[PDB]
Amino acid sequence: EAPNQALLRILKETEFKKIKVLGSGAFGTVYKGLWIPEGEKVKIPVAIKELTSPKANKEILDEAYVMASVDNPHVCRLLGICLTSTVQLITQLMPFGCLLDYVREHKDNIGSQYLLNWCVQIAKGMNYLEDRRLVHRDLAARNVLVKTPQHVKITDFGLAKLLGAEEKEYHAEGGKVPIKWMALESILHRIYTHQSDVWSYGVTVWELMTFGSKPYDGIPASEISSILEKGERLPQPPICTIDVYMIMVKCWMIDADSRPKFRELIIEFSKMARDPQRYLVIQGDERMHLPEEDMDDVVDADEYLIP
Template identity: 35%
Template sequence: MSEEEVKKLLGLDAELYYVRDDVVNHYALSFILPVPSDTNSLHFTWHSSSKVDYRLGFQVENTSAMDQPQSNISAQGEVPRTRSALCIGICFFIYFSCVFGLCVLKYTAHLCVCLISGYPSLRIEKNDLRSVSLLEAKAKVKDIAISRERVTLRDVLHEGTFGRIFHGVLLDEKDPSKEKQVFVKAVKDHASEVQVTMMLTESCKLRGLHHRNLLPISHVCIEDGEKPMVLLPYMNWGNLKLFLRQCKLAEANNPQAISQQDLVHMAIQISCGMSYLARREVIHKDLAARNCVIDNSMQVKITDNALARDLFPMDYHCLGDNENRPVRWMALESLLNNDFSSASDVWAFGVSLWELMTLGQTPYVDIDPFEMAAYLKDGYRIAQPINCPDELFAVMACCWALDLEERPKFQQLVQCLTEFHAALGAYV
């Protein structure tokens, strides 16, 4: 999608692409694209250097809200060898959610087009802006800075408005024949100095901490004239929230779908990492599945929240105070008084446990973010997930006690979940 088209839809000077030079933009495949109600067409450019067949179809959930989309190409055929225009005509009668599905051979691109009257805020949290300049942020990570030449970027794993996460390769400093895989967090060329500074400062949240269930930064690239990059050890199944959602999609057709015991094991690992942070008197403030990663051995690690607001914009909301916050994961005292503690992290852990048991669903999805504080104060909470054992939901409920002293400590959660995991194993 051209810069002009993205500018029209999102008001941003940026491109949106799905496959380019045989590199798949995995995040774009599930990108939530807000489309203004006065938009009557979407324009894409497509071509292939080799023979690729395609099949095109549309699904409309409510035809009273939206006409069946029309395109300037046939329902099936061969992808053109030269750069060509693909136009999809749309007509909306009222604000309503709909889904486009575009499949090109083995590459599948899903655009979830949500018509909304406003967009989620992309403002920077004022608490992160304090008085830290870009020079100061760079100075704090100077001791782990490496040459940009040692880093090779591969696939885009996740992309937002101003940030990207790549799968990269880092060459060994002493022996270039040796290499290791890394996550690379980077900002785009149009990112502001404030956004660059924010990425660097938030990336340092877990720096210097060592635990098997934490993933702190390992290196940075901060050379003059180049946008900074942050490197973290690679976890080959990637972001936990995206992984859970993939599991949900595959659940019906996968005889080896992820088990309840696996999910509880993930929860134990997260609680172990958080217990370590609590002992070190470190408050995370943004614990959620989106800020965890996982590998193919089911090892889970907690990460910082650098770029999270940009990569998961629908999980953050501005309540009129210039702070873009994870409202649906926050404890009541954090919402009302901006008070954060290990106890508020416990609350967020309860919501994260709910995310695990629902395979990545969004909590409180039907509640207006502006009404969350009143909703919680009145004693309401998210419902027990389907097929979630009563004992496990009771653990979640304890995490959401209004009285901070009534919430369990992380070490208690580790013990409780470990015992529950063992009990599940006894029935397998």
């Protein structure tokens, strides 16, 4: 294995000035503020995340480890961490929030072009993680953030595991994974591969095409395992042609090797992105268009590279 020569940058608490809370849950809270490097005359919109026990600090550093070892336009990169007491994770701010809540609140303005483009960008990000031998194990619309309506990034590496040079699959033992996005072999045998992420990709695409619906809605998670064995899958969304829907089905095959690779998914959706109204039928597809005081020195984190 190649030596991971990534750089973990330790940030001072006096550098950034937090504002408000983006969200709060049982997992933790997410803040927002402006990271201002020491005398560099730049202000960077960032998102501060915290999950106060030794158990909490260990798991949050594992995520920080992975997040600081990725460098792709469609993957959230860790900017640095702040040693406070509870460790904070500082990352680039994604103003439009997660993609799931985005499509639910803009379904009457989202065209086929945006939908197919998102599917390409997600597949590009996932393919990158496959190159880094990283298995996400938690791919969903909620785990996809929106920088701009035409640029999304993958995230949440709280379950991401790295495979060795001679390792093909990962074995779990915890019990905190969303069943409705998991592959069949993952539910039954705790086996996680890159092709198990393909299943999650298929469900993720289904979420987007249904404009943010709940997969297997009205069905308990303890019954999902038995249902998949019967051969039952998610239905075909109204806007989807058989071309798009068949791709999802391929991601839901029993044989993991029969499932498409991410690099193949990139090509397929890219072809459809050239003529989006041929593969996605949406009513009024044409007439749809998605959109402080002292902020002249504000620079996006993507334009601020490592000094």
